[PDB]
Amino acid sequence: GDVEKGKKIFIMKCSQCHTVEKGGKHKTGPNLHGLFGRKTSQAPGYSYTAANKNKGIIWGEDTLMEYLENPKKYIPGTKMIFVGIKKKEERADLIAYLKKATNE
Numbered sequence: 001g002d003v004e005k006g007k008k009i010f011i012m013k014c015s016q017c018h019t020v021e022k023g024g025k026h027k028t029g030p031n032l033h034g035l036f037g038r039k040t041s042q043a044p045g046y047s048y049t050a051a052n053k054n055k056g057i058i059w060g061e062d063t064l065m066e067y068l069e070n071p072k073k074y075i076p077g078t079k080m081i082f083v084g085i086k087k088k089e090e091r092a093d094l095i096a097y098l099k100k101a102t103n104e
């Protein structure tokens with residue numbers, strides 16, 4: 001739940017493909033601002049896969065905990081090529097950071 005540690009994980013693991021700031025660029029992956037409490041596939045201006053659109057979950061602490069352990073198990077056919085993060089506490093820290101930064 002540690003936002004300082006989660007920021008560092010974001011930078012190392014995610015930041016090459018994602019921005020989190022309001023109005024931030026889409027890059028390889030979508031800008032993530034506003035995601036908490038949204039369905040998948042909601043960022044206008046981004047080309048998602050049908051797999052992502054068809055997942056039909058709401059993004060939130062628990063769903064992101066599962067997704068980020070193993071993205072392709074959670075959303076088969078996703079084009080996010082990221083193997084996932086093993087440690088539950090590392091995912092928890094990252095998600096706390098995302099919950100701060102994507103709501104800012």
Ligand code: HEC
Pocket residue numbers: 010013014015016017018028029030035039040041042043047048049051052059068077078079080081082085094
């Ligand atoms: C490129 C190598 C990426 C890295 C590293 C990470 N992500 Fe990603 N993400 C990427 C793409 C190309 C996509 C679109 C996938 C699709 O099938 O359309 C995504 C998607 C996400 C999502 C879902 C976004 C939404 O539904 O609106 C999330 C929540 C997400 N990515 C988060 C995320 C995090 C936290 C990362 C670090 C652990 C991370 N991704 C790495 C590309 C890439």
